[PDB]
Amino acid sequence: THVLRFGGIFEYVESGPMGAEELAFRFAVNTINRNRTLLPNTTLTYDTQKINLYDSFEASKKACDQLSLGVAAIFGPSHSSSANAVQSICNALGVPHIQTRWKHQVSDNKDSFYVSLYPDFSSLSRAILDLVQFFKWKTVTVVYDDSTGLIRLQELIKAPSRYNLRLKIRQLPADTKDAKPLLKEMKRGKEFHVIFDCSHEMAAGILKQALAMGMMTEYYHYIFTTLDLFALDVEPYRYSGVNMTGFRILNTENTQVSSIIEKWSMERLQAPPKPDSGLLDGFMTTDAALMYDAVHVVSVAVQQFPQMTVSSLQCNRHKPWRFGTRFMSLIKEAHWEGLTGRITFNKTNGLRTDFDLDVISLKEEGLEKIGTWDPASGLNMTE
Amino acid sequence: THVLRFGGIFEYVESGPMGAEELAFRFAVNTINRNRTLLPNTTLTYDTQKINLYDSFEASKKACDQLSLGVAAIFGPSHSSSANAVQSICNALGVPHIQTRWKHQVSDNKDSFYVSLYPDFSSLSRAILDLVQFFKWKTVTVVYDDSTGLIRLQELIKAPSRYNLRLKIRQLPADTKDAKPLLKEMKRGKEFHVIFDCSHEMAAGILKQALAMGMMTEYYHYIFTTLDLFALDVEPYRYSGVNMTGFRILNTENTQVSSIIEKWSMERLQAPPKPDSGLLDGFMTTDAALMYDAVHVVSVAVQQFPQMTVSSLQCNRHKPWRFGTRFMSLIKEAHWEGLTGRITFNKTNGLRTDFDLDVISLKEEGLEKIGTWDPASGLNMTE
Amino acid sequence: THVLRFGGIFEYVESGPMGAEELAFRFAVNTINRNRTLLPNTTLTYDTQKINLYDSFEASKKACDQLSLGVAAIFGPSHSSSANAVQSICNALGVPHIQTRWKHQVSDNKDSFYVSLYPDFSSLSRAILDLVQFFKWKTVTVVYDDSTGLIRLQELIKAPSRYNLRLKIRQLPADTKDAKPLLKEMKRGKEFHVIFDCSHEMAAGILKQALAMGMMTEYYHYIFTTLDLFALDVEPYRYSGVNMTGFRILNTENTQVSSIIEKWSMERLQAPPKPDSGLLDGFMTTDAALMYDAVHVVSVAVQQFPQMTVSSLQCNRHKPWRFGTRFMSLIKEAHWEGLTGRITFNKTNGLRTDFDLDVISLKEEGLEKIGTWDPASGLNMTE
Amino acid sequence: THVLRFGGIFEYVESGPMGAEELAFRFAVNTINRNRTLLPNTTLTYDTQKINLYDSFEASKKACDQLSLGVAAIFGPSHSSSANAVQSICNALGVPHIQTRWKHQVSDNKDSFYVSLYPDFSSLSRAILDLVQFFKWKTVTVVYDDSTGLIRLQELIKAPSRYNLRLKIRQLPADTKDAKPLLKEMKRGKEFHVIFDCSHEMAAGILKQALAMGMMTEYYHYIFTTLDLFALDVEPYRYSGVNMTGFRILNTENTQVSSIIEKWSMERLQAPPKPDSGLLDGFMTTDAALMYDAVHVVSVAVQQFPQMTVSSLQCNRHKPWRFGTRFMSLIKEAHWEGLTGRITFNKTNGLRTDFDLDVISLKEEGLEKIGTWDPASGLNMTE
Ligand SMILES: *[C@@H]1O[C@H](CO)[C@@H](O[C@@H]2O[C@H](CO)[C@@H](O[C@@H]3O[C@H](CO)[C@@H](O)[C@H](O)[C@@H]3O)[C@H](O)[C@H]2NC(C)=O)[C@H](O)[C@H]1NC(C)=O
Ligand SMILES: *[C@@H]1O[C@H](CO)[C@@H](O[C@@H]2O[C@H](CO)[C@@H](O[C@@H]3O[C@H](CO)[C@@H](O)[C@H](O)[C@@H]3O)[C@H](O)[C@H]2NC(C)=O)[C@H](O)[C@H]1NC(C)=O
Ligand SMILES: *[C@@H]1O[C@H](CO)[C@@H](O[C@@H]2O[C@H](CO)[C@@H](O[C@@H]3O[C@H](CO)[C@@H](O)[C@H](O)[C@@H]3O)[C@H](O)[C@H]2NC(C)=O)[C@H](O)[C@H]1NC(C)=O
Ligand SMILES: *[C@@H]1O[C@H](CO)[C@@H](O[C@@H]2O[C@H](CO)[C@@H](O[C@@H]3O[C@H](CO)[C@@H](O)[C@H](O)[C@@H]3O)[C@H](O)[C@H]2NC(C)=O)[C@H](O)[C@H]1NC(C)=O
């Protein structure tokens, strides 16, 4: 039958197993070619390569190697420096570039052949700003980790100029994990309402230090700017009276989604987590949920485009790929109900501006969905 | 005698002449090989190439072409997306990469072979924060243009948490030049003390719209986060009573520096400026001053390193360059008194953290130096 | 048929075209003899002569030359020294003298044969004094240019003795245009409410210097004692928040008037204005509007007086003209709806004491009519 | 011997004798040709003509009649409308025009052939402004009669903007003499310090009405802007405690001057004054003192210019007079010690800017000199 090779560039884990985004890329390909309603006669193979993700030259060598063998799409590195190098290769040679993670799009880049399945922080930081108005906050503290988190939360930072907030912007201490001298200044300065822009690995580690500082009381309210708050072990904090608000795009109330997440924890089973962490065992990251979705949204666009053949492109003798102009238009016009919900693009750029969130909070039983955010509607927090 | 080829990647201006950074690269090479005290027996040639500066793939092709012919250094593109691609090529192949413009160094990039002659905004935004304390400001408004200007001014944004400022952070309207709906909200909100993070082309255009709005009075004070405030036509604003503070690293009080800037306006003479702009005629940008300096600081390191030969490196069959490890250590240990003053590097990274500024302000006679900033000392504003 | 010669004495422009008052005199004659409802059988010819306007001896030679050839009226020079010489010639020889510009009538001059179509400053400076009471001013600054402007604004100057004003009377600097040392004393003395007695050429030039001084703010209010404020390019000042009040007798809301002003800009088309002025292109001065009106008000009086023949009068062998006694009474009793509105005389003297003004002000869309002044009524400022 | 005809245009007094300025012109000619040290061999004759002084056409006919017969100078009418007509005739035909009375020089008149022996109100109203500062006044009231008196006192009116005065500007009631409704408003408004700009005939008549109103007390102080305050009958006001300050240019302390004023009252003896006036009998007006001086200052310039012949000029066939260019330069460079003191001109214009005043006041013995004003020095009021 017809074969159709995809490309992937992932992190080179030296001693341990493959990453969460590489398993999810392998799990999504093996699910589609097993299924018959989705792609009846097309066997997807793949061409995964490993880089260091902090080397734009190694990413550009591995991308041209997959372009020399021939791929239909590039599922991209997961770092801002590495993805920007592969994006310009995929733009030049005509092949689509599938992004599953946020990076800064510079404002004067004329790139067409890319879509990003990560929820755009233009939309996502208007969801946080709806929560600080629903909770009637008037003095907020934004705590970020790296300097790129000012770009992500800029719609929240540009808005004491509209509303009546009073922001204090702080940064987690670099070259360490000990965020206790930060938390002393926040206790002494009476900063009870705090937004944390972290990953779920760092948001879990600074709740231990907010427990040891005695800042997990019924006075403190924490909004987390991460979509994996549902993946934290919240058992030490469930009875403290703390309110811990957040979001969740991973649609874990659909039975078909919870079946796949159940198959995730069972079939993978490798790399048992550190027991002293918190961050529980049987979960999908939203980083691996979007890579499972990224193979399916492209697989919509290959149903709608038969007679598609894989060519062998060259980066040196530069010529664009033939079918790439139409095939990019079918990925941008693709709708899919994945693990993360409705997957629709923007048609100006390739960004998920329209998506369905589920605002979850901490009750005495764990994390519980207490509303829904949508860009068209807003907060439907009727619990 | 000995020849020594340098490499340059510059902007492709289609109809007009070469850019200001490309003339300054050609003017600095022609000055050194004419001079005899600086490089007595070494004739510098060059290998300038043109790219679009918004194409990391075109920058990576032009960099390997200069590496195939053979260069001693790469003087780099002047854009964050393009320079990060060439930096990883120069790191891998061992050749130094000379940067004359700010870009975001991501916090976990292990690159060694680069130096940046642009004044670091870690130091430069502590100079602005000394001015808002010397002027005893308690309510400031930061106005930036692109989202990367939050990274540049983050030491100013993270400091109502230390001091008693009250920041309101606004952005210039994208996809236009009409900043009048921004200035209406700043007049109505009584924002008299304003910091503008702009280029000198955009800071000149929003003083016309602050004149048309009647915001150029004796109530308004403007700090400009650009090193080319000395290059603005300030004749319409000289009598209005406005105070317009800023900085200047271009050492225009040294006779040897003002001789070279005089040779700049005479010998180039091409591309007459738009008469309806403001931004006067006979000036050097600080962008072209740092490219004139960048050829001289590398020329210090080739005096201290004889028997240096140019090899022909390959990006495909990847091998590092032989003399690049020692020759990078001589560029990082080079001192030079250029057009911008003392040029010293950081030895942890290749960043100008230590530099001499000259804080200038608007009087009734024009722009006038009213102090000096230094990282060791601080504001010596004794005028 | 019947011919009827008029006389005109105008400014000798050496290199350029004819003046605005001489075109309007030629445009009004060519309109009347083309029209059939107005003067069905009477062809008006004219006898225009040029003087320097600062030479009462040259004006008296040119007036007797037109009296020797024979005219029905003299439309007069436009200067106080020259018009007073021709007025006494026209009084002695019986011929009417038509004035379209203000001059000081000395209080003991027994002259009968003259009418003045310019709005009398006895009435016109009571219109300004209604505005300083409607705007509730209590400290005003009158700025005039020549010493005759104290005679014009004497009803405004004699009235801190009645009302509770506090006048400070200043003069524009002679032998120059640089009114900046005047404006420094007005800023330092906190003179926010200012009346300018200028022409429209000088009122436009001191708004540039009030912009450069930063005196065009929302604190400053400017009343202009000129009827050509509607002819200023106000685009630099439209957004500054300045209020700029004034008057307008040129009835530019009537369709028949705006048709003639449209024919003015099209048909003349000569002498393009200086582009660096301000004072826009397609306008009539009120000085040329009153000369267009002056030919029509006399043309009313020749409809009501048939069998009128032109005699050849002599200044040496002095005898009065026959029909001049009755024909002067018909000009003083003439009503006309011209470009400037209702044209009625005073019957004691020949002065327009009763006229219709339209008080205009500066909004964010330009100059806009915000009321109406009338000597019988007063300010009907209901906008 | 040599004859030298002068011209004069004076007021046509119908029933009574000749005017005071015409007697003084006849008395000065008869004194010079009698004297031998002044003009040893030159017999001055004269060509006096009478006009109505309010008719610029009659003044221009009489001036050309004296130019047709031939004169060396024109001693001019004494009215602003009539003198401006003769000035332009004398400028055109080259003959000097001698003025003995103030009139408004319009600011853009290019006339050369005229000198004015009346003290310039640019200097004279700085003498009044020195008195309101010497008397430490802070609230003054200027009362004038005709609208031209704002031009005369404009240096006094433009100076609450410099000093700390508070002017209230009032006007004497036209078409009447009854200034009692004016004086009621000045008593009720508590206007004790008053400047009167009047003639000596009107300043004498409003002291009767200030006596009848009971405003001649020790609370009221009156400065008079007339040089004939020494000619008022002050016997009713000498004991009332009123202070009545003023000036005097008529040098009545010189023995040679008081001899001529004694010959004035004796030899003329005609037109006895009205006994109910006040304004005493045996005085010279300063109007007739300056006409006595005007013949002598021109007689200086004919000593310094021999071979001077009188030509017959024509106003119709216009040609300038031959010797007029040099002879005008000798009148402008003439020094003379007349009845009014030092007579020096200005050399830019023909105006007496430099003159010697004698500030006189009312004591219990009459009017008494209490100081001296000079433009170079100022008030030497050491009594
Ligand atoms: C395709 O992309 C553009 C660019 O981001 C999207 O336009 C953006 O639309 C959002 C709302 O739909 C605008 O954000 C904000 O909306 C809130 C709530 O309605 C309101 O406070 C303001 O009006 C505010 O602007 C955003 O400004 C706008 N971006 C631009 C550049 O105009 C567009 O919605 C996307 N198309 C889709 C999702 O179909
Ligand atoms: C090489 O680079 C490092 C990194 O930029 C330089 O260290 C930096 O030094 C500045 C002061 O010179 C630090 O800023 C702040 O200074 C204020 C007062 O000036 C002080 O109170 C703060 O606690 C803070 O120290 C800056 O934080 C620091 N950077 C780091 C990462 O520690 C270093 O000076 C450079 N070495 C050279 C130029 O030789
Ligand atoms: C013919 O001319 C005379 C002279 O100008 C006109 O008389 C003038 O009328 C105005 C009022 O319309 C007088 O102004 C002042 O008005 C204020 C309030 O409006 C009032 O309180 C004052 O007492 C004064 O009346 C002006 O003084 C007056 N002129 C004279 C010399 O009395 C007359 O209206 C003209 N006739 C017409 C147009 O039919
Ligand atoms: C020839 O005529 C000119 C024009 O009037 C005379 O210049 C004038 O000189 C006077 C003083 O000499 C200036 O007046 C004022 O002086 C006082 C006291 O010194 C002082 O407060 C100011 O400086 C004030 O200006 C007057 O401004 C000035 N006029 C001009 C147009 O500059 C000149 O003095 C005459 N030449 C003579 C008398 O030799």
Ligand SMILES: *[C@@H]1O[C@H](CO)[C@@H](O[C@@H]2O[C@H](CO)[C@@H](O)[C@H](O)[C@H]2NC(C)=O)[C@H](O)[C@H]1NC(C)=O
């Ligand atoms: C094979 O893929 C198809 C996708 O078209 C799956 O069909 C889905 O069925 C569910 C049933 O609840 C519905 O949401 C839609 O009909 C399909 N989902 C989509 C289009 O997102 C089908 O279930 C897959 N086969 C297996 C065995 O899972």
Ligand SMILES: *[C@@H]1O[C@H](CO)[C@@H](O[C@@H]2O[C@H](CO)[C@@H](O)[C@H](O)[C@H]2NC(C)=O)[C@H](O)[C@H]1NC(C)=O
């Ligand atoms: C050629 O370059 C050298 C640079 O070393 C110039 O020599 C002087 O070098 C010292 C070293 O610090 C500086 O302090 C001086 O300011 C330099 N002199 C200058 C700039 O005039 C040398 O002058 C250069 N040659 C020419 C012709 O300018």
Ligand SMILES: *[C@@H]1O[C@H](CO)[C@@H](O[C@@H]2O[C@H](CO)[C@@H](O)[C@H](O)[C@H]2NC(C)=O)[C@H](O)[C@H]1NC(C)=O
């Ligand atoms: C010729 O002049 C007459 C002037 O009377 C114009 O006729 C109208 O006259 C009445 C009289 O009051 C005015 O109210 C009208 O407004 C006049 N009509 C206008 C100005 O259109 C007549 O129209 C003139 N002829 C032309 C061709 O304009």
Ligand SMILES: *[C@@H]1O[C@H](CO)[C@@H](O[C@@H]2O[C@H](CO)[C@@H](O)[C@H](O)[C@H]2NC(C)=O)[C@H](O)[C@H]1NC(C)=O
């Ligand atoms: C004739 O005129 C001369 C003018 O030169 C008179 O001379 C004056 O004499 C007095 C004597 O005190 C002095 O002021 C000057 O010598 C002359 N005055 C001037 C020049 O102004 C002379 O007195 C006259 N003759 C008679 C009889 O009066």
Ligand SMILES: *[C@@H]1O[C@H](CO)[C@@H](O)[C@H](O)[C@H]1NC(C)=O
């Ligand atoms: C907990 O959340 C609820 C609503 O979500 C709010 O009423 C309460 O104040 C919160 N507790 C805090 C902010 O300590």
Ligand SMILES: *[C@@H]1O[C@H](CO)[C@@H](O)[C@H](O)[C@H]1NC(C)=O
């Ligand atoms: C909001 O939530 C309620 C749940 O009761 C649901 O019925 C409704 O459709 C939701 N959306 C809107 C727009 O109200």
Ligand SMILES: *[C@@H]1O[C@H](CO)[C@@H](O)[C@H](O)[C@H]1NC(C)=O
């Ligand atoms: C101008 O600067 C001076 C000194 O720093 C200050 O007094 C004045 O207020 C400033 N002008 C402003 C803030 O408009």
Ligand SMILES: *[C@@H]1O[C@H](CO)[C@@H](O)[C@H](O)[C@H]1NC(C)=O
């Ligand atoms: C600052 O002021 C002068 C200006 O040149 C300088 O000489 C002085 O040494 C400086 N003082 C310091 C750095 O303490």
Ligand SMILES: *[C@@H]1O[C@H](CO)[C@@H](O)[C@H](O)[C@H]1NC(C)=O
């Ligand atoms: C403009 O006019 C309005 C209404 O008369 C007034 O409120 C405002 O103060 C004026 N602006 C000034 C005086 O600057």
Ligand SMILES: *[C@@H]1O[C@H](CO)[C@@H](O)[C@H](O)[C@H]1NC(C)=O
């Ligand atoms: C003033 O305003 C309206 C608008 O023109 C007008 O109709 C009205 O009659 C006038 N009222 C007066 C003059 O009282």
Ligand SMILES: *[C@@H]1O[C@H](CO)[C@@H](O)[C@H](O)[C@H]1NC(C)=O
């Ligand atoms: C009279 O004049 C003297 C000085 O000339 C002064 O002291 C006194 O106050 C005057 N009398 C008044 C102003 O009533």
Ligand SMILES: *[C@@H]1O[C@H](CO)[C@@H](O)[C@H](O)[C@H]1NC(C)=O
């Ligand atoms: C002022 O008057 C005195 C009178 O004693 C006199 O001596 C002096 O010369 C006069 N002039 C000046 C300039 O002092």
